[PDB]
Design a protein around this ligand. Structure first.
Ligand SMILES: Cc1ccc(-n2nc(C(C)(C)C)cc2NC(=O)Nc2ccc(OCCN3CCOCC3)c3ccccc23)cc1
Length: 325
């Protein structure tokens, strides 16, 4: 048990071990608040997350446990991972706050070579997480860490990048909702503008159908919601657009990979595994270093336990954490 020192950053207090210095507020909000700091034990700059009120409700305590256990299983280059994780209390009774650490990467994702490297790393990071049965569901430029080397990591701190089959609100889509999010990002990189800046769910939907055109008899026969079907079918029939003319001036392999990422039928959208195998990442693909992730247990997701129960479980995770080599 190292020396823990206290300090009031923003409207918040911070009680972290001596080894972390130059605590510089970087961001706060709906999650906890992050501070950039320097790790004298390893010489590296880090990002430290102080989870808000870890266990103020059952949703807070469950969510807490869910972040810790994920990041504790996440070990990939193109995916945020756990350097350290600590707290100032000894014994479960005193356990009140949790802090997380990671490689300070600087800047958020917010040149055909640059969109080539950049996007390749997202799909590489996605295939991995997805291979563990995890779906980001919140993929957007602000959730993509990138250093000056253009090296990019995925994390999770709009509707604009959300998949169609979840604007209407589906109860069980697939992992490719993430692939749609990528296609939206790749389009922003190449053009500079937000593909679908819908002002509302319904608006956003109009926007999306304008480019991709409205559903076919095959897709339509795949929606249970009369409401959802009634909303879509109730929109003026629209011809899908000529992506070529939409993204004129871009490498036609990038245009072609897009056509495969922005398909309304999640059942016919390209997966990450498959995306990496596109000709657009020929200069970067290598099937021998696009790893998958060990098996991830999220059966806990299904249960409803007491806050103290969720709390103990997390206490446990903390103390059983082993730092990377
Ligand atoms: C409940 C919950 C469960 C899971 C998540 N979740 N899911 C993912 C995956 C899917 C991408 C693996 C990632 C996360 N969690 C995070 O992305 N958490 C974080 C966000 C931003 C951070 O630092 C921001 C500062 N930024 C980082 C890089 O350096 C520059 C600044 C963090 C710093 C230290 C520890 C966690 C951080 C989130 C919440």
């Amino acid at each position: 048990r190292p020396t823990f020192y206290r300090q009031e950053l923003n409207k918040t207090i911070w009680e972290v071990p001596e080894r972390y210095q130059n605590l510089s507020p970087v961001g706060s909000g709906a999650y906890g608040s992050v501070c950039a700091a320097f790790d004298t034990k390893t010489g590296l700059r880090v990002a430290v997350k102080k989870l808000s009120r870890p266990f103020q409700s059952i949703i807070h305590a469950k969510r807490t446990y869910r972040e810790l256990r994920l990041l504790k299983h996440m070990k990939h280059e193109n995916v945020i991972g756990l350097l350290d994780v600590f707290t100032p209390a000894r014994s479960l009774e005193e356990f009140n706050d949790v802090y997380l650490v990671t490689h300070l990467m600087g800047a958020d994702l917010n040149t055909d070579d640059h969109v080539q490297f950049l996007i390749y790393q997202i799909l590489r990071g996605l295939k991995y997480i997805h291979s563990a049965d995890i779906i980001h569901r919140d993929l957007k430029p602000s959730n993509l860490a990138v250093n000056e080397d253009c090296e990019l990591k995925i994390l999770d701190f709009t509707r604009w990048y959300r998949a169609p089959e979840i604007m209407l609100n589906w109860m069980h889509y697939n992992q490719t909702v993430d692939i749609w999010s990528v296609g939206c990002i790749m389009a922003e990189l190449l053009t500079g503008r937000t593909l679908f800046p819908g002002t509302d769910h319904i608006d956003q939907l109009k926007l999306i159908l304008r480019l991709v055109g409205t559903p076919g008899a095959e897709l339509l026969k795949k929606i249970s919601s009369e409401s959802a079907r009634n909303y879509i079918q109730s929109l003026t029939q629209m011809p899908k657009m000529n992506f070529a003319n939409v993204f004129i001036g871009a490498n036609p392999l990038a245009v072609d990979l897009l056509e495969k990422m922005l398909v309304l039928d999640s059942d016919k959208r390209i997966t990450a595994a498959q995306a990496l195998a596109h000709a657009y990442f020929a200069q970067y693909h290598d099937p021998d270093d696009e790893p998958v992730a060990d098996p991830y247990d999220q059966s806990f997701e299904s249960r409803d336990l007491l806050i103290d129960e969720w709390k103990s479980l997390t206490y446990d995770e903390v103390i059983s954490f082993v730092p990377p080599p």
